[PDB]
Amino acid sequence: NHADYNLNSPLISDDIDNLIRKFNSLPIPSMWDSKNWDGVLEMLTSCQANPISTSQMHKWMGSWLMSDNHDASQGYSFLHEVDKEAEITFDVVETFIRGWGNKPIEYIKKERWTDSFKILAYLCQKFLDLHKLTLILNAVSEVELLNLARTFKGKVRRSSHGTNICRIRVPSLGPTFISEGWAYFKKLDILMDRNFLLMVKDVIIGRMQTVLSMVCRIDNLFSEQDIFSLLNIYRIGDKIVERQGNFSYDLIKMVEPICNLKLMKLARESRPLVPQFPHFENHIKTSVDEGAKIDRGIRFLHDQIMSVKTVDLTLVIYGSFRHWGHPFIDYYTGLEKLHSQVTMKKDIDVSYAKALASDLARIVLFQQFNDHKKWFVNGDLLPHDHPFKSHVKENTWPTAAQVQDFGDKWHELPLIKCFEIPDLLDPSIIYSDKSHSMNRSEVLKHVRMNPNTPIPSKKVLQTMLDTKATNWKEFLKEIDEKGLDDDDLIIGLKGKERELKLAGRFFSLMSWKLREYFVITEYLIKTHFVPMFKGLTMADDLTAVIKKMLDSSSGQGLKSYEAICIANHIDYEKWNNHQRKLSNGPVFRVMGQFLGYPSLIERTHEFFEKSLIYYNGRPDLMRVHNNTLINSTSQRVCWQGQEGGLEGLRQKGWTILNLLVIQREAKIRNTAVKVLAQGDNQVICTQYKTKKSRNVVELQGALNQMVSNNEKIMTAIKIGTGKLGLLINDDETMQSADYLNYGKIPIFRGVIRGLETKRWSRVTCVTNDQIPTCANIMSSVSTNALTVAHFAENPINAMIQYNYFGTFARLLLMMHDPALRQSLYEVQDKIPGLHSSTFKYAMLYLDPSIGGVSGMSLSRFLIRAFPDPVTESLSFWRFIHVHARSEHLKEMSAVFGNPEIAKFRITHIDKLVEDPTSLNIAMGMSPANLLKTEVKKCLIESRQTIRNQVIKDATIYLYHEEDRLRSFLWSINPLFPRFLSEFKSGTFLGVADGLISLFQNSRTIRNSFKKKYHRELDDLIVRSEVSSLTHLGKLHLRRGSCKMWTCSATHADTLRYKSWGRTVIGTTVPHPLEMLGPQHRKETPCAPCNTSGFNYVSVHCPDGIHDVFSSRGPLPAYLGSKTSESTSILQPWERESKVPLIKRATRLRDAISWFVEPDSKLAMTILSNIHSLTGEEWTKRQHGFKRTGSALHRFSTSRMSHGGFASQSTAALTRLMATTDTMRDLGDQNFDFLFQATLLYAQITTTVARDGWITSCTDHYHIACKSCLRPIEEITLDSSMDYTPPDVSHVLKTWRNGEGQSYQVGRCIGFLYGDLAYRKSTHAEDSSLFPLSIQGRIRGRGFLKGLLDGLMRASCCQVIHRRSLAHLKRPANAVYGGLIYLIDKLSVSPPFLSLTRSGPIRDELETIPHKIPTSYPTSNRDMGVIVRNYFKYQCRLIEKGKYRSHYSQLWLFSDVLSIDFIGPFSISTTLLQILYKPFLSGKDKNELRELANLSSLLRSYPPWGRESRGTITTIPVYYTTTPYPKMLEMPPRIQNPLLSGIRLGQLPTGAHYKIRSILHGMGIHYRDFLSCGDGSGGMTAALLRENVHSRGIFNSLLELSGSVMRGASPEPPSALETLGGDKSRCVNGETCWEYPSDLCDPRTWDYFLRLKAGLGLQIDLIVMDMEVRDSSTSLKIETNVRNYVHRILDEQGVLIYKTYGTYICESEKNAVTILGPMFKTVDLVQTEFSSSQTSEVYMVCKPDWSSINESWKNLYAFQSSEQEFARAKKVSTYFTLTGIPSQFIPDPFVNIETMLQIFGVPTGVSHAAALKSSDRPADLLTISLFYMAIISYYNINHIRVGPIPPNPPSDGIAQNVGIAITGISFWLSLMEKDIPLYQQCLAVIQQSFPIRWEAVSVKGGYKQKWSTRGDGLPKDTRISDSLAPIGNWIRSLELVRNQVRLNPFNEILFNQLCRTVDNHLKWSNLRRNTGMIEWINRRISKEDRSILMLKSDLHEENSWRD
- Say whether 1575 counts as a known binding-site residue: yes
Instruction: Choose the binding region for Zn ion from 728-736, 1081-1089, 1749-1757, 1990-1998 (rule: CB under 5 A).
Output: 1081-1089
Instruction: Tell me whether residue 715 or residue 1267 sits nearer to Zn ion (CB atom).
Output: 1267
DSSP 1771: H
Which residues share a beta bridge with 190? 185
Cα torsion for 1428, 1433, 1436, 1437, to the nearest 10°?
Answer: -140
Which residues within the stretch 424-443 sit at the binding site for Zn ion (CB under 5 A)?
Answer: none
Of positions 469, 637, 786, 1047, contacts Zn ion by CB under 5 A: 1047
Residue nearest to Zn ion (CB): 1265
Kind and range of the H or E run holding 128: helix 115-137
Q: Which 3 state secondary structure label does DSSP give 1257?
A: strand
Which residues within the stretch 724-753 sit at the binding site for Zn ion (CB under 5 A)?
Answer: none
- Say whether 1183 counts as a known binding-site residue: no
CA distances from 119 to 134, 209, 1540, 1893 (A): 22, 12, 71, 71
Is position 1809 an interface residue for Zn ion (rule: CB under 5 A)? Answer: no
The verdict on whether 908 is a catalytic residue reads no
Instruction: Choose the binding region for Zn ion from 194-202, 1087-1095, 1163-1171, 1768-1776 (rule: CB under 5 A).
Output: 1087-1095
Instruction: Tell me whether residue 198 or residue 1075 sits nearer to Zn ion (CB atom).
Output: 1075
The verdict on whether 1106 is a catalytic residue reads no
**Alpha-carbon Rg for the chain in angstroms:** 39
- Say whether 47 counts as a known binding-site residue: no
Is position 870 an interface residue for Zn ion (rule: CB under 5 A)? Answer: no
Q: Among 817, 1736, 1819, 2002, which one carries the catalytic annotation?
A: 1736
Instruction: Choose the binding region for Zn ion from 68-76, 201-209, 325-333, 1063-1071 (rule: CB under 5 A).
Output: 1063-1071
Is position 1268 an interface residue for Zn ion (rule: CB under 5 A)? Answer: yes
Is position 1044 an interface residue for Zn ion (rule: CB under 5 A)? Answer: no
Q: Among 354, 1552, 1554, 1720, which one carries the catalytic annotation?
A: 1554
Rounded to a whole number of angstroms, the minimum distance from the CB of residue 1194 to Zn ion is 21
| # residues contacting Zn ion (CB under 5 A) | 9
Rounded to a whole number of angstroms, the minimum distance from the CB of residue 426 to Zn ion is 40
Is position 1076 an interface residue for Zn ion (rule: CB under 5 A)? Answer: no
Q: Using an 8 Å Cβ cutoff, are 816 and 827 in contact?
A: no
Q: Starting at the earlier edge strand, list the strands of the sheet with 1568-1572.
A: 1511-1516, 1718-1725, 1735-1740, 1694-1699, 1661-1664, 1568-1572, 1591-1595
Rounded to a whole number of angstroms, the minimum distance from the CB of residue 1071 to Zn ion is 9
Rounded to a whole number of angstroms, the minimum distance from the CB of residue 836 to Zn ion is 30
Which residues within the stretch 1163-1182 sit at the binding site for Zn ion (CB under 5 A)?
Answer: none
CA atoms within a 13 Å half-sphere pointing along the CA-CB vector of 1125: 18
Instruction: Tell me whether residue 1059 or residue 1258 sits nearer to Zn ion (CB atom).
Output: 1258
Q: How many CB atoms lie within 10 A of CB 315?
A: 22
Instruction: Choose the binding region for Zn ion from 70-78, 1256-1264, 1342-1350, 1626-1634 (rule: CB under 5 A).
Output: 1256-1264
E-assigned strands of 1252-1310? 1257-1261
Q: How many CB atoms lie within 10 A of CB 1300?
A: 14
- Pairwise CA distance, residues 336 & 1456, whole Å: 60
- Pairwise CA distance, residues 68 & 60, whole Å: 14
Rounded to a whole number of angstroms, the minimum distance from the CB of residue 1098 to Zn ion is 8
- Say whether 680 counts as a known binding-site residue: yes
Of positions 47, 1089, 1324, 1883, contacts Zn ion by CB under 5 A: 1089
Question: Pairing state of beta strands 751-752 and 745-748?
Answer: antiparallel
- Say whether 1508 counts as a known binding-site residue: no
- Say whether 237 counts as a known binding-site residue: no
- Per-residue contact flags (x/-) with Zn ion for residues 1524 to 1543, judged by CB under 5 A: --------------------
Is position 1086 an interface residue for Zn ion (rule: CB under 5 A)? Answer: yes
The verdict on whether 494 is a catalytic residue reads no
In terms of phi and psi (left: phi > 0; alpha: psi -120 to 50; beta: otherwise), the region of 1389 is beta
- Pairwise CA distance, residues 1619 & 1248, whole Å: 41
- Say whether 1014 counts as a known binding-site residue: no
Cα torsion for 1617, 1618, 1621, 1625, to the nearest 10°?
Answer: -120
Of positions 488, 953, 1074, 1221, contacts Zn ion by CB under 5 A: 1074
Instruction: Tell me whether residue 86 or residue 850 sits nearer to Zn ion (CB atom).
Output: 850
Of positions 978, 1260, 1554, 1838, contacts Zn ion by CB under 5 A: 1260
Rounded to a whole number of angstroms, the minimum distance from the CB of residue 1631 to Zn ion is 11
Is position 675 an interface residue for Zn ion (rule: CB under 5 A)? Answer: no
- Say whether 1630 counts as a known binding-site residue: no
Of positions 421, 1075, 1534, 1663, contacts Zn ion by CB under 5 A: 1075
The verdict on whether 1385 is a catalytic residue reads no
Rounded to a whole number of angstroms, the minimum distance from the CB of residue 1047 to Zn ion is 3
- Say whether 166 counts as a known binding-site residue: no
Instruction: Choose the binding region for Zn ion from 320-328, 714-722, 1252-1260, 1939-1947 (rule: CB under 5 A).
Output: 1252-1260
Instruction: Tell me whether residue 393 or residue 1082 sits nearer to Zn ion (CB atom).
Output: 1082
Give me the count of residues in the chain. 2002
- Go through the chain and list every residue after which a break occurs, taking a C to next N gap over 2.5 angstroms, comma-separated: 1300, 1500, 1742
Of positions 1265, 1657, 1953, 1966, contacts Zn ion by CB under 5 A: 1265
- Pairwise CA distance, residues 867 & 862, whole Å: 13
Instruction: Choose the binding region for Zn ion from 105-113, 685-693, 734-742, 1039-1047 (rule: CB under 5 A).
Output: 1039-1047
The verdict on whether 409 is a catalytic residue reads no
- Say whether 540 counts as a known binding-site residue: no
- Pairwise CA distance, residues 1351 & 1702, whole Å: 53
Rounded to a whole number of angstroms, the minimum distance from the CB of residue 1057 to Zn ion is 17
Q: Closest by alpha carbon to 12, among 348, 230, 246?
A: 246
Rounded to a whole number of angstroms, the minimum distance from the CB of residue 1260 to Zn ion is 4
- Pairwise CA distance, residues 951 & 932, whole Å: 16
Instruction: Tell me whether residue 582 or residue 1089 sits nearer to Zn ion (CB atom).
Output: 1089
- Say whether 1346 counts as a known binding-site residue: no
- Say whether 1422 counts as a known binding-site residue: no
Q: Closest by alpha carbon to 1176, among 1057, 1259, 1271, 1293?
A: 1293
DSSP 1152: G
In degrees, to the nearest 5, what angle opens at C-alpha 1601 toward C-alphas 1600 and 1603? 75
- Pairwise CA distance, residues 411 & 591, whole Å: 10
Is position 630 an interface residue for Zn ion (rule: CB under 5 A)? Answer: no
- Say whether 1074 counts as a known binding-site residue: yes
CA distances from 1890 to 983, 1863, 1911, 1917 (A): 72, 15, 10, 6
Rounded to a whole number of angstroms, the minimum distance from the CB of residue 145 to Zn ion is 54
Instruction: Tell me whether residue 334 or residue 1070 sits nearer to Zn ion (CB atom).
Output: 1070
Instruction: Tell me whether residue 998 or residue 1263 sits nearer to Zn ion (CB atom).
Output: 1263
* Burial state string for 225-244 with b = 16 or more CB within 10 A and e = fewer than 16: ebbebbbebbbbbbbbbbbb
Is position 1097 an interface residue for Zn ion (rule: CB under 5 A)? Answer: no
1770 exposed, middle or buried (CB, 10 Å; 0-12, 13-18, 19+)? middle
Q: Closest by alpha carbon to 1245, among 100, 105, 218?
A: 100
Report the catalytic residues. 1193, 1554, 1665, 1698, 1736
Contacting residues toward Zn ion, per CB under 5 A: 1047, 1070, 1074-1075, 1086, 1089, 1260, 1265, 1268
Bind-site residues for Zn(2+): 1047, 1074, 1086, 1089, 1260, 1262, 1265, 1268
Bind-site residues: 571, 680, 1047, 1074, 1086, 1089, 1260, 1262, 1265, 1268, 1570-1579
Bind-site residues for Mg(2+): 571, 680
